Design a protein around this ligand. Structure first.
Ligand SMILES: OC[C@H]1C[C@@H]2[C@@H](O)[C@@H](O)[C@@]1(O)CN2Cc1ccccc1
Ligand SMILES: [Br-]
Ligand SMILES: [Br-]
Ligand SMILES: [Br-]
Ligand SMILES: [Br-]
Ligand SMILES: [Cl-]
Ligand SMILES: [Cl-]
Length: 833
């Protein structure tokens, strides 16, 4: 908001396979693979068995070219900057005969002075992308060992020598697409005097009465002279000025450091999702020179405190978030890249994912270390939606090199992204890596390497994750928590360690343990736990042709990357469900299974507060069509788990838990106010509609702010008989003083396969309009875990994957911009004879 001018270099690009001298139009920002796809030069990489078919690309080099005009007047601007916000990865940048840059890090933006190099008339930019494979083959050959990066799907684990998105080389839920290109925007900036290279709003203190801030600016002045300037900072809320400060300086050639304090009396605090409004102030800094604003930069700032509490206690070592003075039980998921080709992920896709988190009652996301440091948009959406961000550094599942050159590179990405992200209200903590110390301690490396090589790995770990990264963070983000690794001490098969910090509880899934083990195997903080499902059929039909709808078709197997996966789903299914004979019925019960099992854990974690202080499931989302632990498939479709997670994350929850032939009922509130004079009411109901015995009433119940408390216990013996337990359900409701409902739950006393479910018909009525579909569903008898299925990709539902209770009408709204609709209603009893 200044005298500067910006030219976007996002049109007129062309690409070539090096050596062919053949050029075709390209899209920038973009990827080599998409450019081919666009010209039919590659098949849909996500279809069938096409993974093998597209690998040849990572063995070639790729060249990109563009031209632009510069007028004489633009050339007389004091400064002209070319900015690359992302180059993937080994890129020689040439402009008008000049090598501007040899890029070598995907996660770094490059700002380049180019005015002395530009010409009036046309100017030619040319970028040579060395293959990341062929670039690192010599590095590999000199190493004398293979890094154990199992998720890198190649004989040679070259991923670890490159500062490039780990997941691009393969992963246990991902396709290998080792891509290249200009992956974030190219901008050209014509300005006078100076640019602001950094604007940091440092919060010094915050009380109800006053926020004290330090506006810290790095101004890069590009002219030979000493230029007097007034630096101004304006603070506004909804377009109205709250406070304003200025300062006189004389700017010197080169870098200038400027600090202005500003205070906000009676600050309006940023609150996390569920606790209030995620209020964002506007901070705007300007360099004024005479009458003209030569440089301006702004941030949206949330005024809040975040403290990670990680302290010894009677139970081991705590691990929790206190927000604005209040311990906050974390509710969320682990986030992976939204696509195999990152520039394909649109503004709308970003927005919809944040809607999906907000709607599932989440207050936190982990940006896990095998993906990317996400774009600015991702964090702006987290700020405005009240989602705390746990940021891994981009290291996962393997030890990494630690030589001086490697570390210099990593240091630049650390400094680059820390300054990129440190102004975000949503940013809560840094974490050095995913699972590397657990890897080094427990994954059997000491039998795979010489003792000398093992030790170099262990020394190299400390160099990067206990020295370099914690010290960069101390320097640039000094009031933000850092931890060297998730999980930092706790291991899933070592019970003695579960009271020490955070857990990845992979006993469920990998360890084959029943979902009921989440009730007894409790963490101080769950940072990962998970279970897999096939996506629904419209997503299968996106990759598989009708003749491939078998669990082990070649095409199905190309889309399962846990080699353990498919048979394990069957094993868990069998414990709890009758395994359907049709593949479509298996997919439907698989969704129900994943959702029911996982919510039982989410529930155990909240129920066990304050011992347990958070739960993030593995994983929120998918990068392509695949069988995975996700709760939302690649096309935006909520699996059962997403609806179940929403239910289990509700601010107030009635949690009935039945162990040892006995029912407990807990009231769990993440509310900031205490609820008083509450009534729990329950009744047993058979599958035809009919109350068994009488309503149970528990009056005078209090539900304190931020607690989980037991308010009801009853033995099952003498209340219900084994045949009642298989032919009925508990309905639970919570009402305030005046009989107003604040919560409800349904409880089944037996495993679904043990239920005597009646053959029933779910009937519906449709009232279809533009983009909307109102369904009213009725069934005389209980219909178990119903799935309302439509062929419309990305259709949203007010509800789904729920029990349709006996003779109780149920309204569901389906929306999609593409509604001018086939409905298929599945339920458990239909799946078997
Ligand atoms: O398996 C799905 C995910 C669970 C976490 C998680 O941190 C991701 O890195 C994984 O892909 C891998 N680890 C677990 C894992 C590590 C090593 C071997 C198997 C599984
Ligand atoms: Br310049
Ligand atoms: Br510059
Ligand atoms: Br200075
Ligand atoms: Br070795
Ligand atoms: Cl239970
Ligand atoms: Cl039981």
């Amino acid at each position: 908001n200044d005298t500067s001018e910006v030219m976007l270099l996002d049109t007129g690009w062309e690409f070539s396979q090096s050596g062919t001298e053949k050029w075709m139009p390209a899209t920038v920002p973009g990827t080599v693979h998409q450019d081919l796809i666009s010209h039919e030069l590659l098949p849909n990489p996500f279809y069938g068995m096409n993974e093998k078919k597209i690998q040849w690309v990572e063995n070639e080099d790729w060249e990109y070219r563009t031209s632009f005009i510069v007028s004489e007047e633009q050339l007389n601007r004091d400064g002209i900057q070319l900015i690359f916000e992302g180059l993937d990865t080994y890129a020689d940048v040439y402009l008008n005969g000049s090598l501007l840059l040899k890029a070598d890090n995907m996660f770094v933006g490059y700002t380049l002075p180019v005015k002395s190099v530009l010409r009036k008339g046309e100017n030619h930019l040319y970028i040579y992308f060395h293959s990341p494979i062929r670039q690192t083959l010599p590095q590999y050959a000199s190493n004398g060992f293979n890094y154990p990066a199992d998720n890198d799907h190649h004989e040679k684990h070259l991923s670890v020598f490159s500062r490039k998105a780990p997941y691009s080389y393969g992963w246990d839920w991902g396709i290998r697409m080792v891509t290249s290109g200009v992956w974030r925007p190219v901008t050209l900036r014509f300005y006078d005097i100076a640019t602001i290279s950094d604007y940091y709003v440092r919060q010094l203190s915050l009380t109800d009465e006053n926020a004290r801030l330090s506006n810290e600016l790095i101004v890069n002045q590009i002219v030979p002279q000493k230029i007097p300037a007034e630096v101004r900072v304006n603070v506004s809320l909804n377009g109205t000025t709250v406070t304003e400060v200025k300062q006189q300086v004389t700017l010197q050639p080169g870098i200038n450091h400027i600090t202005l304090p500003a205070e906000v009396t009676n600050p309006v605090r940023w609150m996390p999702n569920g606790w209030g409004t995620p209020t964002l102030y506007d901070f705007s800094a300007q360099i004024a020179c005479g009458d003209r604003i030569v440089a301006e930069q702004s941030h949206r700032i949330g005024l809040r405190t975040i403290r990670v509490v990680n302290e010894k206690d009677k139970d081991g070592e705590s691990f929790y978030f206190e927000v604005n003075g209040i311990p906050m039980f974390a509710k969320g998921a682990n986030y992976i890249p939204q696509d195999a080709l990152l520039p394909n992920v649109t503004t709308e896709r970003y927005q919809t994912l944040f809607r999906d988190m907000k709607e599932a009652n989440m207050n936190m996301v982990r940006i896990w270390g095998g993906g990317t440091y996400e774009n600015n948009l991702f964090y702006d959406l987290a700020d405005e939606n009240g989602i705390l961000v746990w940021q891994d550094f981009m290291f996962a599942c393997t030890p990494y090199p630690s030589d001086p050159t490697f570390l210099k590179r990593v240091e630049a990405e650390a400094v680059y992204n820390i300054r990129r992200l440190r102004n975000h209200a949503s940013l809560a903590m840094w974490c050095g890596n995913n699972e590397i110390l657990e890897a080094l301690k427990y994954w059997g490396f000491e039998k795979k390497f010489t003792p000398e090589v093992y030790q170099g790995l262990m020394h190299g770990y400390d160099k990067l994750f206990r020295e370099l990264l914690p010290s960069t963070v101390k320097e640039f983000d000094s009031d933000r928590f850092y931890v060297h690794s998730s999980p930092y001490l706790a291991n899933w098969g070592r019970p003695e360690s579960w009271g020490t910090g955070d857990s990845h509880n992979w006993g469920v899934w990998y360890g084959k343990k029943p979902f009921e083990s989440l009730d007894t195997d409790l963490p101080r903080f769950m940072s990962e736990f998970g279970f897999q499902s096939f996506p629904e059929m419209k997503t299968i039909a996106a990759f598989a042709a009708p003749e491939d709808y078998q669990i082990e078709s070649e095409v199905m197997n190309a889309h399962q990357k846990s080699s353990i996966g498919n048979s394990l789903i069957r094993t868990y299914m069998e414990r709890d469900y009758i395994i359907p004979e049709s593949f479509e019925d298996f997919v439907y019960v698989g969704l129900v299974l994943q959702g029911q099992g996982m919510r039982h854990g989410l529930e155990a974690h909240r129920r066990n507060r304050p011992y347990c202080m958070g739960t993030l499931y593995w994983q929120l989302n998918d990068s392509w069509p695949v069988v995975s632990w996700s709760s939302i498939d690649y096309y935006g479709n909520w699996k059962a788990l997403h609806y179940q997670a929403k239910r289990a994350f509700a601010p107030v929850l009635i949690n009935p838990i039945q162990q040892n032939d006995s029912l407990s009922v807990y009231l769990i509130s993440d509310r900031l106010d205490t609820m008083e004079q509450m009534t729990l009411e329950m009744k047993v109901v058979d599958f035809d509609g009919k109350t068994l015995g009488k309503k149970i009433q528990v009056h005078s119940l209090e539900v304190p702010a931020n607690t989980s408390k037991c308010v009801y216990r009853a033995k099952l013996d003498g209340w219900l008989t084994p045949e009642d337990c298989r032919r009925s359900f508990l309905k639970l409701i919570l009402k305030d003083k005046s009989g107003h409902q604040v919560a409800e739950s349904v409880h089944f006393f037996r495993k679904t396969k043990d239920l005597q479910l009646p053959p029933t018909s779910v009937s519906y009525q449709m009232k279809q309009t533009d983009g909307k579909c109102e369904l009213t569903l009725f069934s005389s008898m209980l219909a178990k875990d119903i799935f309302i299925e439509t062929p419309l990709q990305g259709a949203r539902y007010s509800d789904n994957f729920f029990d349709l209770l006996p003779g109780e009408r149920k309204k569901v709204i389906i929306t999609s911009p593409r509604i001018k609709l086939p409905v298929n209603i599945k339920h458990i009893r239909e799946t078997y004879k």
